[PDB]
Design a protein around this ligand. Structure first.
Ligand SMILES: O=C(N/N=C/c1ccc(Sc2ncccn2)o1)c1cccc(F)c1
Length: 253
């Protein structure tokens, strides 16, 4: 109620965030869909994602310096008006003066996320929004609206004032933020609740979450595939999501 009574940890890899099943063509051999179209949308979607991260989120600057959380380098940020500040003409390339030149970028990344997480058309201006809307619709027709079905459970946890949902993924932070922004997961996934388990591992992020949210809350993990007293909700199947949704409506979860 006043605090987070329950906390949900999502591992949307192998389905949404990381969809390597598309590119390998195994997705169509598993589900009987067309094999070539599946790979086509995958390469097209990955193109728009990395275009959004390069053109807006300084991905080339932060590719090798990818953090685990967005608020990690807030210690070296001297808050200043940087509207005139142009990031291209600074000392940054490839630290008290250069680690000072890293946080304001991530504060800018947080600003772009928290401003266009529900107005992606104002960030990637149409026709780019019209291109990705057609792009998502074509992929959702193959997966039988998996992301749309998965968003029903995400918004359900989000609306609960005692519940919050966090994201732990193996991709780098900036690409994962680009995927969450584009896919429409901006509202249901607060930017401070996204963890890129790339440098450390999945377990160092779990303890990172429990350290922040405390042990007085019930931790549940909903994901796919593979301690710390956190029950796991393997949700690979499509009708599985219906049951998880079904359990949330009746407050069993
Ligand atoms: O829908 C998306 N991923 N779905 C993945 C997935 C794996 C298994 C199933 S269930 C199913 N699939 C096919 C046939 C029968 N049942 O869905 C998606 C990923 C990234 C972006 C985006 F916009 C959408």
């Amino acid at each position: 109620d006043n605090e987070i009574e329950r906390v949900f940890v999502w591992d949307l890899d192998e389905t949404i965030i990381i969809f390597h099943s598309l590119l390998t063509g195994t997705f169509a051999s598993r589900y009987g869909k067309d094999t070539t179209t599946s790979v086509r949308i995958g390469l097209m979607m990955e193109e728009m994602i990395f275009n959004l991260a390069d053109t807006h989120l300084f991905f080339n600057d932060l590719e090798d310096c990818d953090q685990i959380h967005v608020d990690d380098v807030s210690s070296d940020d001297n808050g200043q008006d940087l509207s005139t500040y142009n990031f291209s003409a600074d000392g940054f390339h490839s630290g008290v003066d250069w680690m000072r030149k890293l946080a304001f970028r991530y504060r800018r990344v947080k600003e772009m996320y928290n401003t266009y997480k529900n107005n992606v058309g104002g960030l990637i201006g149409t026709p780019k929004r019209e291109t990705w809307l057609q792009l998502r619709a074509e992929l959702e027709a193959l997966t039988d609206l998996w992301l749309t079905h998965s968003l029903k459970a995400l918004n359900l946890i989000n609306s609960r004032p005692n519940c919050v949902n966090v994201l732990v993924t193996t991709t780098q932070l900036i690409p994962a933020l680009a995927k969450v922004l584009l896919y429409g997961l901006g509202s249901v996934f607060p930017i401070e609740n996204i963890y890129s388990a790339t440098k450390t591992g999945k377990e160092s992020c779990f303890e990172r979450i429990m350290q922040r949210f405390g042990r007085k809350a019930v931790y549940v993990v909903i994901g796919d595939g593979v301690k710390h007293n956190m029950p796991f909700w393997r949700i690979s199947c499509h009708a599985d999501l219906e049951a998880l949704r079904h359990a949330l409506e009746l407050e069993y979860l």
